[PDB]
Design a protein around this ligand. Structure first.
Ligand SMILES: *[C@@H]1O[C@H](CO)[C@@H](O)[C@H](O)[C@H]1NC(C)=O
Ligand SMILES: [Cl-]
Ligand SMILES: [Cl-]
Length: 310
């Protein structure tokens, strides 16, 4: 129910370092609100304003990944082959939200940390799935302690941009303490390594072949749990997604700037979709979850799929 800027301002409590900045800012909100009203309900899909609606597509994309994702680096670590192709048949519907008590939806806020939330999310899922333990891990510890300037053995850039594979690497070698012990501030800080508290590890991770088939991905999800994917988060349709199944968007997209989690799949009246766990609060999508059509590498969903192992 946000009709122009300072309802948006007081709802999301936005402070502006300047008056020059606000002028450049409600125009983007107006044109984002413009995009929302003209698209809401089309193809029976809900779109809606959110905390990010004051940035342009260019700005938001930079907000997510600081224009600095080395795809060459990301492609090099992938498996080179599809899965051994002997797994039987796949169920039409599969939803880890129903097979396990997954942890609550998180909110990365004004920090390009999706890579950290996606990795932590997969790890938390696995602890629920294999041990029936609900834990909340510290994304902030990932942001700071995989920071390249802090530890050159890692390639992440904090709130700038990052790699979920690098995050899992950290979860193997060091492990993460819980949120309580290293709380989230949506900013790059100096790594605190003398944080005590129990540490939660994974033992391994594997990135699937670039452009993996839906079937490989679905099977991976079935056998290894929720998976990290990298996709085109700053796309207008995905950006403002509420309820509904996003169809016909960005087929075979090569441009990726956002990390999220696949937790399953389903079919609704002829339409095959993915279930996406996002890190933008329960206000986005349907309670923080979104639905994107399968079968077309929509928004680059199949480009960089990674699972982990406890
Ligand atoms: C990207 O990564 C590749 C392989 O790790 C490296 O050779 C290249 O120099 C990197 N480029 C940039 C711009 O970081
Ligand atoms: Cl390692
Ligand atoms: Cl920062």
């Amino acid at each position: 129910e946000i009709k122009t800027f300072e309802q948006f301002k007081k709802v999301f409590g936005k402070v502006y370092r300047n008056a020059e900045e606000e002028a450049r800012r409600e125009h983007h909100f107006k044109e984002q609100l413009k995009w929302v009203e003209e698209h809401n309900g089309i193809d029976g899909v809900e779109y809606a304003i959110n905390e990010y609606s004051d940035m342009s597509e260019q700005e938001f994309s930079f907000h997510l990944s600081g224009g600095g994702l080395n795809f060459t680096y990301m492609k090099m670590e992938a498996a080179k082959e599809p899965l051994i192709n002997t797994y039987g048949s796949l169920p039409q519907n599969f939803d880890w939200r129903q097979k396990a008590r997954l942890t609550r939806i998180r909110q990365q806020g004004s920090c390009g940390s999706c890579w950290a939330f996606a990795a932590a999310g997969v790890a938390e899922s696995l602890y629920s799935i294999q041990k029936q333990q609900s834990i909340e891990l510290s994304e902030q510890e990932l942001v700071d302690c995989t920071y390249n300037r802090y530890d050159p053995s890692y390639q992440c850039n904090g709130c700038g941009s990052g790699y979920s594979t690098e995050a899992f690497k950290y979860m193997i070698r060091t492990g993460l303490v819980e949120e309580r012990n290293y709380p989230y501030n949506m900013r790059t800080q100096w790594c605190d390594p003398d944080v005590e508290g129990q540490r939660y590890h994974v033992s391994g991770y594997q990135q699937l072949r670039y452009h993996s088939s839906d079937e490989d991905v679905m099977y991976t999800i079935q056998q290894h749990g929720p998976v990290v994917i990298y996709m085109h988060g700053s796309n207008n349709y995905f950006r403002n997604l509420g309820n509904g199944v996003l169809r016909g968007v960005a087929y075979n997209d090569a441009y990726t700037d956002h990390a999220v989690i696949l937790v399953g799949w389903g079919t609704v009246q002829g339409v095959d979709y993915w279930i996406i766990r996002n890190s933008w609060g329960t206000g986005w999508g349907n309670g923080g979850y979104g639905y994107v059509e399968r079968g077309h590498n929509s928004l680059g969903i199949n480009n960089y799929v990674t699972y982990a192992t406890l």
